[PDB]
From Swiss-Prot:
This is MAPK phosphothreonine lyase. It comes from Salmonella typhimurium (strain LT2 / SGSC1412 / ATCC 700720). Changing V123D: Loss of enzymatic activity. NCBIfam families: PRK15245.1 (NF011781). Secreted effector that irreversibly inactivates host MAP kinases by catalyzing the dephosphorylation of the phosphothreonine residue in the pT-X-pY motif in MAPK2/ERK2, MAPK3/ERK1, and p38, via a beta-elimination reaction leading to a dehydrobutyrine residue. Is also able to remove the phosphate group from phospho-JNK in vitro, but JNK may not be a substrate in vivo. Could help suppress localized pro-inflammatory responses at infection foci in the spleen and liver, and thereby facilitate bacterial growth. It is found in: Secreted.
């Protein structure tokens, strides 16, 4: 019994429920830091109910909702966002309304502090944002309405970035994405395996969470 077993046995039901739901609306927040503001979070800062920090021993600014909306145990599902290195601040600002939204399905996320990482390293070239996804229900099963909201949210991120003319970054080797995601990619370290390369990606693509996000 597990998050994935539920997705597998309810694969068509979840998809069918999702595709019939009306468009999600996310009320964007305005009183949020810009990218430099984010970097300056230091030991602790607060914005729109998300706890922020940029500790000296790490290279990401972390954001976590004080009162999480998902009650389930993390099942490994996460998204990266990859944009052109020089465009990370612009991209953060463009997405900040959504990422701090009272309506966001993402309780926890982080953005790389570009100043702390070497310009030629892959960490600078892509995956500068991470979004952690957690099953919404206490029994650690995803509900159809939560899956829909997560998918709508990710697609809103894609449209905001493209509408702002943000240039895509370099997607991590370990991630997968469909042709219509220019910035978003999916990873699950719990289900990817020991083989790396093409084999990890093929395994990711068969993941019901990923198929529900993309088909």
């Amino acid at each position: 019994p597990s998050t994935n077993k539920h997705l597998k046995n309810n694969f068509n039901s979840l998809h069918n429920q999702m595709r019939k739901m009306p468009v999600s609306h996310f009320k964007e927040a305005l009183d949020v830091p810009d990218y430099s503001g984010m970097r300056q979070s230091g030991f602790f800062a607060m914005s729109q109910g998300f706890q922020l920090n940029n500790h000296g021993y790490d290279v990401f600014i972390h954001a976590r909702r004080e009162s999480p909306q998902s009650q389930g145990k993390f099942a490994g599902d996460k998204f990266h966002i990859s944009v052109l290195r020089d465009m990370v601040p612009q991209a953060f600002q463009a997405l900040s309304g959504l990422l701090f939204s009272e309506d966001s399905p993402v309780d926890k996320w982080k953005v790389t502090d570009m100043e702390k990482v070497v310009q030629q390293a892959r960490v600078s070239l892509g995956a500068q944002f991470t979004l952690y996804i957690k099953p919404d229900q206490e029994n650690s099963q995803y509900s159809a309405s939560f899956l829909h909201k997560t998918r709508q949210f990710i697609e809103c991120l894609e449209s905001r970035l493209s509408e702002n003319g943000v240039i895509s970054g370099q997607c991590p080797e370990s991630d997968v994405h469909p042709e219509n995601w220019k910035y978003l990619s999916y990873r699950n370290e719990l289900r990817s395996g020991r083989d790396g390369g093409e084999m990890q990606r093929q395994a990711l693509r068969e993941e019901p969470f990923y198929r529900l996000m993309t088909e």
